[PDB]
Every structure is written in C-alpha cells, then in structure tokens.
C-alpha cells in the first residue's frame, strides 16, 4: 500500500479482534504516526498457534511457512471465523509442510512443491522411506477445544525507507471563525491573527501569498477555496501618565494605537487614553502625549490640545 489514507481509527471500534500486538508503535497514535509503505499480509492460522504468532514460538507452520523476522514494523490482528469456517466434519484445505531443505527465510515466496527428505535416504522421485509428503492439510472441529478452531488473520507491516512518507490519514478538522484572534493551522501554516474576507485575485495553483518582507497576508483554505486575509490583532505598549508619587497618586494609562472599543475614556490619535477627562480649553501643557494632545495635573489629570501661544 502506497500513497493512500489509512483509517486506523475506525479499525479499533468497527468490531472486536482477537489480539493487537504492537512493539515500538503506540496503538492510539497510529493516526498521526507516519511510515513510507504499508503491507497487507493475509494469514490463515490455527487457534492454538494464534498465541504462537510471535518471535520465539514455532511448530509445523512457523518453522516452514514464513519465519517471523526480528524487524517487525507493524502489528498483528485476528478475529473469530468459527461461524464461517468451523463446522462438524472438519476442513482439510490449507496446506502443510513436514520437512524441506531448510527453513523458509522471512519474506521469501518459496511457493514451490519440490520433494524433500525427512531423513537421509534418497527419494529418486518416489516418496517413501525417509522421503515423505511435504504437503498436508488443516483440521478444525468445533467439538474440539479452542485451540483446534479456524481463524482468519490479517497482519500489517510497514516500511521506513529513504523516501518521502506517503501513507497517513489526517482525520483532523475544525470549523472556521472570523474577526477573532485564532491560532490557526492551515495545512502546516501556524500563526495568530484575525481571519477576514479578502478581495484579492489568486490563481488556482497558489496555496497562499505573502506581500512584502516574507510576511503572510492571504491564506487559501484547501476545503472550499476562498482567499482569507491575515492580520495580527491589536497590540501595543502601555504607558502611565503620572504627576509623581510625592505630588499625588492618581494616574492615567495609555494604549498605543489601540481602539478602546476593543478593550473617563477619551479617544485620541495615539489610542484611547483612559483615566483622564478631556477639557475643551487649551493651556500650555507640560506632559506631552502625541498629535497635539497632552495632559496635566491641576485635582485630577486632564487632557488638552496644545496652545502654541
């Protein structure tokens, strides 16, 4: 399996399996864990050998079918197929092997059916003394124990080759809001700002855009294809207008270029100054603020417009 989206999450809750054996890969994090390739391996294994699907336990099957390697990258899954494969009378379909030249190495389709010796005497093309059938068949009976019941087994193995990853399923999504500071994550773009409708003119191959100095301004959501502007919401320093601790204690605080509608209150060119009343008069002030507006203490802090003379 390559270049496909894996729905591992639905597998855990769609039904119940027999076992789920993972080593080095956490089960719940398979949704965001990434490999390069996925192998779907089809298995038919006796119930007694279900626990024997592990490196260390062998038998008539695990010693000659496909030896389990020490480099497993994946997990085993099996389920009960008694209602589909178990019946009174038995089944004698799937093949055995008694002895061969050597044990089959991991991942070697030695499907061939050559003649091999269990002892040392030659066969001469005729099976007999120390030359037996290298093929037999299963046997499963529901009247027998749990270890003599048929099963269907599917085991996944992965790869981590020197190639870009291709098989991961991002079942992650969130709604879209606007005109609020949101820590958005748009296909890898992480930042903070307010989403607003734009009037730009994109081309249908451009994920996003940046105007000047490598700063992102418009981002295109890859679900409904709209261009959304990006703006970092209001910020700025805070300055305190004080007449000194010895003189008095009442103070007025400034917010640089911040609209107080988003935070007496007086609106100035350098942000809404709060804590001081605006007087219609105009005196020779002492504490400057900006854009011709100032402040002075004479029994509360009051703001004026500068009187040149």
């Amino acid at each position: 399996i390559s270049n496909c989206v894996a729905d591992y999450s639905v597998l855990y809750n769609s039904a119940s399996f027999s076992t789920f054996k993972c080593y080095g890969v956490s089960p719940t994090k398979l949704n965001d864990l990434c490999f390069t390739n996925v192998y779907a391996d089809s298995f038919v294994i006796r119930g007694d050998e279900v626990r024997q699907i592990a490196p260390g336990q062998t038998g008539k099957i695990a010693d000659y079918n496909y030896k389990l390697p020490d480099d497993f990258t994946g997990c085993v899954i099996a389920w009960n197929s008694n209602n589909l494969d178990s019946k009174v009378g038995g089944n004698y379909n799937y093949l055995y092997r008694l002895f061969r030249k050597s044990n089959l190495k991991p991942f070697e389709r030695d499907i061939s059916t050559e003649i091999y010796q269990a002892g040392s005497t030659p066969c001469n093309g005729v099976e007999g003394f120390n030359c037996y059938f290298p093929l037999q068949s299963y046997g499963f009976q529901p009247t027998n124990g749990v270890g003599y019941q048929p099963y269907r087994v599917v085991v996944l193995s992965f790869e981590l080759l020197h190639a870009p990853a291709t098989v991961c399923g991002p079942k992650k999504s969130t709604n879209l809001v606007k005109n609020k500071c949101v820590n958005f994550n748009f296909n890898g773009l992480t930042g903070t700002g307010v989403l607003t409708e734009s009037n730009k003119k994109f081309l249908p191959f451009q994920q996003f855009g940046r105007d000047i100095a490598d700063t992102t301004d418009a981002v295109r959501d890859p679900q409904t294809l709209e261009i959304l502007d990006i703006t970092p919401c209001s910020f700025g320093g805070v300055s305190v207008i004080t007449p000194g601790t010895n003189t008095s204690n009442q103070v007025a605080v400034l917010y640089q270029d911040v609209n107080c509608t988003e935070v007496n209150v007086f609106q100035t060119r350098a942000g809404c100054l709060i804590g001081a009343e605006h007087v219609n008069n105009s005196y020779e002030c002492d504490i400057p603020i900006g854009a011709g507006i100032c402040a002075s203490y004479q029994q509360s802090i009051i703001a004026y417009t500068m009187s040149l003379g």
Partner: nanobody
Amino acid sequence: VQLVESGGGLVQPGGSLRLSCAASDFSFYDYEMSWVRQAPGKALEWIGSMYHSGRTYINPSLKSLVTISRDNSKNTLYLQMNSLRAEDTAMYYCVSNWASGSTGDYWGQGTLVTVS
C-alpha cells in the same frame, strides 16, 4: 487464450471420463493446477491439485478414487472420476493455481455432475 478448460457435460457414475484443461504455454503453469468445486453453502472443497513440481497431493479419501495424468503438448490434464455423487454437482471448474487466490488463476467455462 492463456488458460482454458475442456471436457464435462454429463458425467456417468462408475465410468471413466477423460477431462481436459488446455492452455497456451507451459510458462504460465506456475505454480499449481486444481480441479475444485464451490458448492452452495459448503465450505472450500478442492477435489484436485496438480502442482508445478509434478506432484499431486489429494485428500487421502480421494486420491485413490482419482487418476492423474499431465500433458505438455497442449498442456492438458487428464483426470477420471468414478462412482459420482450429488455433492460434486456444481459449476465444475479447472482452476490453475487455485491456492494462489482469485487473481493469479483462471476460471473455466464449467460443467455439471448429475446422477440420474
């Protein structure tokens, strides 16, 4: 055609019928030949298995009842059934590489096995 089958029609119980399974070349004969049945409701039952290595391993209660003969001119297989029963009454297939699943195999035209 790469793989085909022949013979069939109506099989007389007790007698011998020379069934056939032709093909185009021996290079396509990896790795198995098999004449099987898929009865309604019955599980997988395989009546024959001719192997690439010139081996025929059959159910011990069937291999005595079955004669085996393999050809290479037309790459046909000769198999004879006697004392027929109604459990074989299905679309009798000649499946080359039956154990290799339903993608590396050919399903023949089919025939029937009926007992009067």
